Design a protein around this ligand. Structure first.
Ligand SMILES: CCCCCCCCCCCCCCCCCC(=O)OC[C@H](CO[C@@H]1O[C@H](CO)[C@H](O)[C@H](O)[C@H]1O)OC(=O)CCCCCCCCCCCCCCCCC
Ligand SMILES: CC(C)CCC[C@@H](C)[C@H]1CC[C@H]2[C@@H]3CC=C4C[C@@H](OC(=O)CCC(=O)O)CC[C@]4(C)[C@H]3CC[C@]12C
Lengths: 52, 390, 36
């Protein structure tokens, strides 16, 4: 418990997944908020709805 | 009228020179608009619920569509998408405001007067307007149409004489009022001068202009705008911040005021329509029939505005409902044909309104550009200074 | 399981094929989905 991780989600408490080939979807957990920040600012450049 | 007896050739060259389609001949004096209410079939006055619900529901649907889109893409959209949703919302609200103007003159649903009063109040509030004061100013306008020095609730023109007086008081053309007039009636901001109208309502918030027996009714009228601007304009801001304000309220507001101002300004202003003083040849029927211009729009725009351009019919038959205004016009165009004036909304018309017809001089009884007029009257200032030699 | 890493840009490998180019570039061997 004393060590946390960071994730990016919707407002409605749902993980955002990166589906690739053959509808296989990958999640993520980052030990630093800069990583989730990079993920979201990459989401914004190809979808502004989810990133907003 | 200004262009009296003269062949059709000069009429039509003036017409296509100014952008009008059919110019007008000359109406006899000594009449009244309420006369021609006998030329109308009696079926035009009938009430039907179909057109009523259609007129209250189409602009509501346009507004809802614009808002659903705009919120679905709140602030991720570029400026042109914002402009287009604002234009759509402004036009939808101009339609609902025409409905409210109908309820103010008591000719939308006369069977249920309490309901139509409540409906008019509700639809007028979001524009920060009062229903009783609106009724009063519109009646005062109908009674004084095109009367010089008296029609203060319409596009009263800036005359040459008052301009000369202000220039003699200012000691030059650089004062504050000078530059104010300069930018208000020379730039496209003129197409929004209706906002000035908005500020002249609330007659100083002064209950000393009205008849005492009506105080409670007038006060109530002022409390519906305020309540809006006191309960709803906070929420909007608090829920969207400055941007969420300027895109959800201020831009539709500016579009609505564009519609209001352009409609009225085109309605009662043209180079061949004179502004006679009182006692000096002002005639009621002559000013309400010959001194009116009918604007034609595409039928989608018309059905979105609830036929808001057809103003002549409801000045001769003030009880004529809103959905019978197109048809009725077709009747009058047959009998009053040679006297009416008509125009189509095009770029040339607005360019002429902005750049050419700016000052009204009564000696020539016509409109002339502001700059040439001011430099001419300034050259006559120099010549009277030379005449002031001794 | 885990994901192999190689700090060349730091390439990676999963059991798709990430490449956290220092930014991000989640290659495939396109983040339009949401959990349920
Ligand atoms: C919608 C359809 C609704 C159906 C109802 C249609 C009924 C039509 C009646 C409407 C009458 C409208 C009259 C319009 C009118 O009076 O305005 C036209 C009036 C001009 O009118 C004259 O104005 C003069 C100025 O003092 C005097 O007041 C005259 O009395 C007045 O007649 O507009 C002005 O008052 C102009 C001066 C105000 C300066 C404008 C401020 C600009 C601010 C910029 C806004 C932000 C822009 C970005
Ligand atoms: C602040 C925003 C978000 C909400 C809308 C506010 C309006 C309801 C306010 C702001 C501007 C106000 C007007 C600004 C100017 C005047 C003139 C003022 O009276 C005078 O100036 C009288 C003549 C004189 O002082 O010489 C008070 C009424 C009125 C119409 C005000 C009425 C109330 C208005 C429309």
């Amino acid at each position: 418990a004393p060590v946390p991780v960071y994730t990016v989600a919707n407002p409605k408490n749902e993980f955002v997944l990166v589906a690739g080939e053959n509808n296989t979807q990958l999640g993520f957990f980052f030990f630093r908020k800069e990583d989730a920040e990079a993920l979201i600012e990459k989401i914004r450049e190809e979808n502004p709805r989810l990133a907003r | 009228t200004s262009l009296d007896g003269l062949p059709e050739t000069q009429k039509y060259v003036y017409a296509d020179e100014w952008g009008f389609s059919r110019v007008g001949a000359d109406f006899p004096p000594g009449s009244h608009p309420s006369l021609f209410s006998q030329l109308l079939p009696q079926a035009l006055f009938a009430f039907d619920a179909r057109a009523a619900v259609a007129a209250v529901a189409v602009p509501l649907a346009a507004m809802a569509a614009g808002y659903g889109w705009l919120w679905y893409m709140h602030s991720i959209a570029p400026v042109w998408q914002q402009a287009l949703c604002a234009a759509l919302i402004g036009t939808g609200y101009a339609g609902l405001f025409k409905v409210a103007h109908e309820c103010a003159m008591m000719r939308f649903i006369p069977q249920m007067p309490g309901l139509q009063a409540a409906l008019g109040t509700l639809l007028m509030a979001p524009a920060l307007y009062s229903l009783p004061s609106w009724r009063l100013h519109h009646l005062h306008h109908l009674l004084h149409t095109n009367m010089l020095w008296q029609d203060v609730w319409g596009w009263h023109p800036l005359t040459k004489v008052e301009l000369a007086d202000e220039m003699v008081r200012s000691g030059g053309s650089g004062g504050a009022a000078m530059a104010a007039a300069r930018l208000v009636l020379t730039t496209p901001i003129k197409l929004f001068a209706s906002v000035g109208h908005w500020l002249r309502s609330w007659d100083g918030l002064d209950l000393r202009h009205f008849h005492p027996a009506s105080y409670v009714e007038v006060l109530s009228g002022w409390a519906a705008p305020l309540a809006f601007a006191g309960l709803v304009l906070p929420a909007v801001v608090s829920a969207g911040g400055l941007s969420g304000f300027v895109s959800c309220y201020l831009a539709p507001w500016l579009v609505f005021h564009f519609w209001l101002s352009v409609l009225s300004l085109t309605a009662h202003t043209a180079p061949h329509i004179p502004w006679r003083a009182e006692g000096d040849g002002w005639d009621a029927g002559r000013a309400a029939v010959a001194g009116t211009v009918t604007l034609r729009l595409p039928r989608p725009l018309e059905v979105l505005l609830n036929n808001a351009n057809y103003m002549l019919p409801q000045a001769v038959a003030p009880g004529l409902p809103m959905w019978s205004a197109p048809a009725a016009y077709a009747v009058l165009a047959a009998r009053l044909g040679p006297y009416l004036t008509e125009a189509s909304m095009s770029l040339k018309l607005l360019t002429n309104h902005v750049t050419r017809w700016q000052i009204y001089d009564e000696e020539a009884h016509t409109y002339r550009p502001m700059e040439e007029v001011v430099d001419e009257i300034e050259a006559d200032l120099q010549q009277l200074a030379a005449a002031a030699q001794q | 399981x885990x994901x192999x890493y190689x700090x060349x840009x730091x390439x990676x490998x999963x059991x798709x094929x990430x490449x956290x180019x220092x930014x991000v570039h989640v290659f495939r061997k396109x983040x339009x989905x949401x959990x349920x």
